Amino acid sequence: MKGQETRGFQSEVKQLLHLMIHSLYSNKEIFLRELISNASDAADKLRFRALSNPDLYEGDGELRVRVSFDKDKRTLTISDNGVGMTRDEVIDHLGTIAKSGTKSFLESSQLIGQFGVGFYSAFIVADKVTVRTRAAGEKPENGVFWESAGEGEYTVADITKEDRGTEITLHLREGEDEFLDDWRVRSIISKYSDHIALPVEIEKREEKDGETVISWEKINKAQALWTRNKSEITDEEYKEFYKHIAHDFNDPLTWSHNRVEGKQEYTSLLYIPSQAPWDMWNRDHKHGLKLYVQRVFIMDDAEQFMPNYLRFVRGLIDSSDLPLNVSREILQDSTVTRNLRNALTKRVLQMLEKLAKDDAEKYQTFWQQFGLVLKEGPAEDFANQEAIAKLLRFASTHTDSSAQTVSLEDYVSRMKEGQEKIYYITADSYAAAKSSPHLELLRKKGIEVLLLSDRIDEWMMNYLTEFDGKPFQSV
Amino acid sequence: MKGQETRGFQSEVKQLLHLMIHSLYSNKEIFLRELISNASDAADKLRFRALSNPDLYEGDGELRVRVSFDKDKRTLTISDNGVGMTRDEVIDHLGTIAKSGTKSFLESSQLIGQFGVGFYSAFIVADKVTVRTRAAGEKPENGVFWESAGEGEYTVADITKEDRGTEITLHLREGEDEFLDDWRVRSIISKYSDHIALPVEIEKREEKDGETVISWEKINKAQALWTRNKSEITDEEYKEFYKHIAHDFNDPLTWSHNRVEGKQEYTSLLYIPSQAPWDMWNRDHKHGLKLYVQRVFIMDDAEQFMPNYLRFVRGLIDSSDLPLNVSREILQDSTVTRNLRNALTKRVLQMLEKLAKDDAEKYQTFWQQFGLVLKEGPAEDFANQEAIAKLLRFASTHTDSSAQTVSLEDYVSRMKEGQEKIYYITADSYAAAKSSPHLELLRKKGIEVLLLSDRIDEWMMNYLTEFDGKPFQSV
């Protein structure tokens, strides 16, 4: 094992780790979920490359993730046999962190703020993590090694490893002996893996005379979630699975699992978040559905199936109309895309309509988080303009608040005589529109006024020129 | 009085009449409404022609219908200075009709059923009707006289009418003296004239010392009803106005009044008849919106603003983006037209939908009447397949009738944890269909199956294979 080198974590990473830790000891069972989520992602990566060249499965073609513990060495080990990593990859992915989290770090009993990051979840429970990975296809003499007390630096070196995949060993802190108990760990892997197609085995040791008797019984049922029938899939499974594909700690507000067989044979499973991603307002930001084909994972962040004013959506698409060779290029100049695209655009509005009716408190959350993104909507897609206006919420004079708790239908159902219109006011701050003008001309008569004060509102009212009869007019 | 000639009525007019007099004696006050209504139509015609050739108003350009009565002679006279008629016009329009069906089988509690008023309603109240008229642009020696007792024949002749227009005189049947009363008559006009733009003036007679001064004073507000604000229009006015522009005694199921103003500047006012016209099915029937350009009437029965799937929609449409020259032709290749046929097509649907929600009984009534034509829809309007389907209804398996009670939105409210479904079934009448194959098992599960029996159902199904969320299918 020669080639030892030591690096420094991005100045902001130490700021994440040490922070995230205290912030999550409330939910520490997490790491075990995040590693499996990753073992799963590592398996799809393999099956993908394997399409192109089916020899990467050199030997075993049955992917799986194994858990086990040295009650004596105080360790827990999770080892899958997926793509595995390359040394240069090890340094890119593990060594760093592709995303962001600095402009907010210096701000703000389960203290969370805004989710940490998958893999490092491990340090909430381990004071030393070790990885030994051997990339798919490559040589067993180029296995890598990554060690880190997570204090501030980490180490890499080259090693050998016959088997392919990734082996992660966590050296538990003191007062974590829970994860060295069969029922406890078993319980957790049980709880965190139903949404996962990858079989999840767990080490079983039995003393049947002679030597020792090792096994690996799977706790996992194993079944691509979007494959089974809604009728049998529970909400627990629907929620964690979202977390899985969304790479987010929080839960979702709702979901639309749908199968379709006709002109567009696909099978979507979109999700509606609950918190807006911290990096949602800067150009380079991941958005798009996890694209599948013939149940074969292909690409991620494929934005070409969702119109811009719906970036915030999340989920997969198990199409069958797309060629198994779909590229990032092909997709953009595809008709089956443009079709699927619009066919799904509606499914999100339908999912939203259904939401706003069943749980308003959940919908209000939705509105707050993704308010200004849905608004730039009827400004370049009048196709569905009505459904998109109904989904819209505003701040009215009926409420003695800045609370965007009013639907346009709420506004109509409370009109009077001397009607014909929905009057608004376009200011800057809620204050600059609730008292700073001349709505009083109307207040003296008893007519409702929509107090709009969000930067985009003015530009939006140039495309929204009426809502079911009653036209819109400024004051 | 030269040219004197008597003529006989067509065979069903002598029938239509006698039948009409008893069927409508409940509403005798009705004739007064129909003469002013016609007087108004004359004022329109004139202004229309007046465009191309302003000589027509020859000097007297203040249009108005004047009502008066005489107690000792016992007559009620109505006279307008509208377009007036010529001898050939008279004979064509007054001596005949264009509204058949063939019955009168009910002879040998009011009996209305389904039939057309118009001019003849005058006989309900009058045992003799006289008409002196002289069309615009015609030497006064070209006046025309028409007189009939509604008994079977009529008399035409030439007279000299220096005045332009039409003077109608009724000799009231005995026991009709309640129409010689200034207050009863003055109340009827008022009730039937405030939804009419043509000033309606009533006569006045006084005793100014040995002399007799004849006043005339408007009783009317005289304003195009689609020009006023939705708020100042009584539901009564909307329904009278309906009878006006639709030439139908029956009230409408609903209406939609809208003043669009932006790219497309127009004013629409549509309605949905309480019952399909007797002569509907017969491609040689007149459907259409009455068309006005710059508050000037131009033409009736213009088909170009409503798709064949919504031909039954009565109503008018004032416009501003069209030229005071539109003709049955230009509309064919005009873009402003098409854009309205769309903007409006998508306004009928909203009215239809607000109908299936404010009074579900009228919608049913509507469905029984025109459903069959609203079905031929999704086979041509793909852009509105959403609202269309949300409208149309069928007979189920949960229903004890051929009666089309069930809507597609309540088959989902009454759909269970069984699956993704909206099963339908074809055949002929409700008969050879409710008792046929593979409907048994779907039953053993407690599932419903929309039973189709309409000659078109299967064809129409083809184009509507979606309906929000749940996907369609046969059995």
Ligand SMILES: Nc1ncnc2c1ncn2[C@@H]1O[C@H](COP(=O)(O)OP(=O)(O)O)[C@@H](O)[C@H]1O
């Ligand atoms: N078991 C594994 N096999 C291969 N790559 C892995 C594995 N675990 C983690 N990785 C790599 O680490 C990267 C970052 O991990 P993570 O912190 O969980 O964020 P994310 O996985 O969502 O990208 C992944 O993109 C992947 O390249």
Ligand SMILES: Nc1ncnc2c1ncn2[C@@H]1O[C@H](COP(=O)(O)OP(=O)(O)O)[C@@H](O)[C@H]1O
């Ligand atoms: N006062 C009038 N001035 C001119 N033409 C008239 C007048 N009254 C009736 N007419 C003509 O005679 C026809 C007969 O009247 P009516 O029974 O009401 O049929 P309609 O419903 O089309 O008016 C009218 O359509 C019109 O052509």
Ligand SMILES: [Mg+2]
């Ligand atoms: Mg991850």
Ligand SMILES: [Mg+2]
């Ligand atoms: Mg008439």
